[PDB]
Structure formats: structure tokens, C-alpha cells
Design a protein around this nucleic acid. Structure first.
Ligand SMILES: [Mn+2]
Ligand SMILES: [Mn+2]
Ligand SMILES: [Mn+2]
Ligand SMILES: [Mn+2]
Ligand SMILES: [Mn+2]
Ligand SMILES: [Mn+2]
Lengths: 244, 244
DNA sequence: AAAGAT
DNA sequence: ATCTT
DNA sequence: AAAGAT
DNA sequence: ATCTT
């Protein structure tokens, strides 16, 4: 399927290629920086060709946002199924050590999920799936050699500011947690768990509807959430007692 | 000087080289996407070897932040004079049509300008200069050929998601404006002007003391500033009548 | 965690 | 770190 | 703008 | 878009 082929194409591409710099039309190579600002961008770009290849294979049109900061990174669909679109969003995070618990910021909980056409490429109700392709890497620290340029012949000599990169594809609602991923920018935090948990989908919500009801009614601050709900068991009580 | 060779070197690098993609150790190249998320990352990495080379030519040590979310992109100082540090921060913005007035978000007004050691690599009082390396580029819609990968023999035909990139170096305070650059992330907004004004320094503050005093006493919300000041004029009047 | 930093 | 509305 | 989105 | 305190 599209989904099983995508997952496999992403495991293999990440297995076979290591990004090591940005290159210019004249052949000069600039090394990468070590922060997630930089690597977040590199993994999404790395991902574009793979996603397009699989999506065409499965007869799906791929469309990146035409406008800035409009979700999702990739909208796939068949023209014969206009309201059965698939949203795919890239997310990156780092670990200080290999194999420990990781957590992603999954987008706003006050934009399109509370308003059908806010910050989204196509109205929300036209999407049947929302997939997250998550990347995890182990930070490394940039050396003095990351401040020089290189040519196409010194490629394996460029230092990479990461090691142990892992990638997964899973449904947004499945990996969604119950604590905000950011404050002033109101993002849904994902579960905080090991890589296998994301791949396998050991989440906390019972269904995508519970995922949606919970993030749609989550208050922005802690005083406001204080006596409504702050986590899923309190939300389940809240539901139980008549949403009050 | 360091400053003048750097401005010269940034102008020349930008003229001679055109960033067209990210390359892997194995030689495969992934094209660039069109948002400022991809391009501010690309320009910053592009600027790294340049900054470092001119800094070494002048006897300055170059340090990038060791922690994420810390200003500035580069700290330069001569080992003989550690309390004479220079901050160089890269910023990017875009244009829809060549020229057109541009504006930049220039960092928070509530972190290090308000607390000597907050979100800054070295205490604020050890820096005697804060430069802004600013890039502007005209947006260009990405083509379908952006979704294919390339080899080192096709570098000249990889489509670029930009055109007309210009670069300048200028003191932060000279180009600062008097209106917030962002709301929830409380950034100083730069003046809104044409590229030439940035290069030339046609700002609004009379001095760096006034720039600092203004952004240090700037209130976060419209309602709060309304009893104090929402602009440069109101601020001079405020100053005039005894800071009330 | 929040809440507020790049 | 910077953009949209 | 201001305020709040990626 | 994600991270630090
Ligand atoms: Mn993304
Ligand atoms: Mn919109
Ligand atoms: Mn930076
Ligand atoms: Mn920067
Ligand atoms: Mn403008
Ligand atoms: Mn710190």
C-alpha cells in the first residue's frame, strides 16, 4: 500500500544516504550546523523526493503548500477522490544519547483543528488521514572543520553534526500525547516514549475522535485547565461527569 | 577592517555562488524547497565559512552557540580582549517582487536586552557590537522537477526556489524599528524599507542608547503600551515628560 | 510540566 | 526564526 | 498593524 | 518549528 511503501522507502533512503552539506551550482559545499533548526530542514528536504516517488506510484497527486506556514508539508490525493486527501507532516527531535525517550511538537491545537480552513492547505474536513513522519537524531557538536568549504571530492571528509538517525511514519492521533508540546505557540505534545513505541503506535488515545475532542477543549494555560482537565484521565472524568 | 572585509566577502560569495541543494556523502542531491524555513537555514550555513575566514584573517576567535535557543549565531572576540565581543546574527526575509519594502524580525526584546545572561552565549555586557547579516530573496514557486534527486553532473539544472538574493551587514540598532516584529514571541521589528536603506543605515533611532531604552521599556500588548508608548514619537514625548 | 525562548 | 491575517 | 500561526 | 529553563 501507499503507507507500507512509504515507510519502507523512508527506512531505506535513510539507510543508504547521509546528508552532509548544502551544495552550490558551481560545486562548492557548505557543512551543516548542529541544531534542530538546521536538521529539521534537512530531513524534510531529504524526504520530498521519496514521498513524491511513492505517491505517484500509487496514483496520488502531491502538493506542497503554496503559502507559508500552512499545514501540511504534503497533501496527497487522487483527483477521483477529492475529499479523501492524506496529510503528511515531517517532525524532527533530538536525543542526547542513542535510544532514550523522545517527544515531538505536533502542530497547533488552535488552528485548523478548531477551525476548518485556518492555516491549512485544504479545508480540514477533506482529509481522511494525518500522518507524521518523525525523525530522531543524536546531537554531536560542530567542530572547527565544519567552518570550511569543500568540493565534490572531499564528501566523506565533511563532518556530520549528527549520528544515529531514525525515521518513522505513524498516524498523528496515535502518537499524540495529553500535555502541550509548547506554550506561547500552543502545540500538541506527542507521547514521550521510545522510538519503537512511535513505530508500533503505543499511544494513549482510544480513537482519533477522542484525540480530537481532547485537543479541541484543552485550555491554553494551566490556570484555565486547572479545574477542567490537564491530562487524559482528568479529561475522561470530565467527559464522564457531563463535560463540567 | 573585520567589518569591511566581511561585508566585501559576503557580497562576493553571494555573487559567485548559488546554493542549489543538499548533498549526501554518497553524492546524491536533494533540491531546495521555497519557504523562508528552508532559506533562512540555507543562508545561515552559507555564511558560516565566510564569517570564520574573515574572522581568522583578523585574529578573531569564532564561537557559535553550544546550546540551542541562544543568541547570537556567531560571537567573535580577540583572545587579548575578551570583554570586547562582537555578536553577528543572520536574518532572512523575502520579497514577492524585486525590491518592494522588506522588514526583519530581529530577536526578542525580553530576553538578553532585559537580563544580562538570558538566552545569550556570553553575558550581554561583554559585547561591544551587535551586527545583523541580513539576506533578502525574491520568492519563486517550486517546480515538479524539485521532487526528483540529482547527481553532481546536473548541478546547473537543479531548479532554485529563489532569485535575486541580496545581502547586507549593519548594526542591529541602526536598522531597528519601533513596532514589534512578532507578537507571541516578542521580537523587535526592524524598519520597513528598501534594501538600500539597510545597507545605508537610514533608521529611526538617534542612537543605540535610545534603541535599547525603547525596547527595554516596550510593553508586550496593545492595551499595555497604550498608557506608555506604541511608537518612537510617543516614546520621545514620554521621555520628554519625565518617563511617564 | 509550564511558559516563554530561537 | 519569521510569517500570515 | 496586533496577535497568533508554522 | 522545537527547544530550554
Ligand atoms: Mn514539518
Ligand atoms: Mn490561509
Ligand atoms: Mn541561527
Ligand atoms: Mn539567525
Ligand atoms: Mn514589505
Ligand atoms: Mn542559557
Amino acid at each position: 500500500s501507499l503507507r507500507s511503501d512509504l515507510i519502507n522507502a523512508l527506512y531505506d533512503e535513510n539507510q543508504k544516504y547521509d546528508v552532509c552539506g548544502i551544495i552550490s551550482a558551481e560545486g562548492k559545499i557548505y557543512p551543516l550546523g548542529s541544531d534542530t533548526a538546521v536538521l529539521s530542514t534537512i530531513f524534510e528536504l531529504f524526504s520530498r523526493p521519496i514521498i513524491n516517488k511513492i505517491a505517484e506510484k500509487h496514483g496520488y497527486i502531491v502538493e506542497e503548500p503554496k503559502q507559508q506556514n500552512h499545514y501540511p508539508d504534503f497533501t496527497l490525493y487522487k483527483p477521483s477522490e477529492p475529499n479523501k486527501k492524506i496529510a503528511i507532516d515531517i517532525k524532527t527531535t533530538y536525543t542526547n544519547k542513542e535510544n532514550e525517550k523522545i517527544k515531538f511538537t505536533l502542530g497547533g491545537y488552535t488552528s485548523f483543528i478548531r477551525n476548518n480552513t485556518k492555516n491549512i492547505v485544504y479545508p480540514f474536513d477533506q482529509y481522511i488521514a494525518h500522518w507524521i513522519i518523525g525523525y530522531v537524531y543524536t546531537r554531536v557538536a560542530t567542530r572547527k572543520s565544519s567552518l570550511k568549504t569543500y568540493n565534490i571530492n572531499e564528501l566523506n571528509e565533511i563532518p556530520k553534526p549528527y549520528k544515529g538517525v531514525k525515521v518513522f511514519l505513524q498516524d498523528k492521533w496515535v502518537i499524540a500525547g495529553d500535555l502541550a508540546g509548547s506554550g506561547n505557540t500552543t502545540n500538541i505534545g506527542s507521547i514521550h516514549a521510545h522510538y519503537k513505541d512511535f513505530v508500533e503506535g503505543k499511544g494513549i488515545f482510544d480513537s482519533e475522535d477522542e484525540f480530537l475532542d481532547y485537543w479541541r477543549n484543552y485550555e491554553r494555560t494551566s490556570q484555565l485547565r486547572n479545574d477542567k482537565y490537564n491530562n487524559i484521565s482528568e479529561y475522561r472524568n470530565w467527559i464522564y461527569r457531563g463535560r463540567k
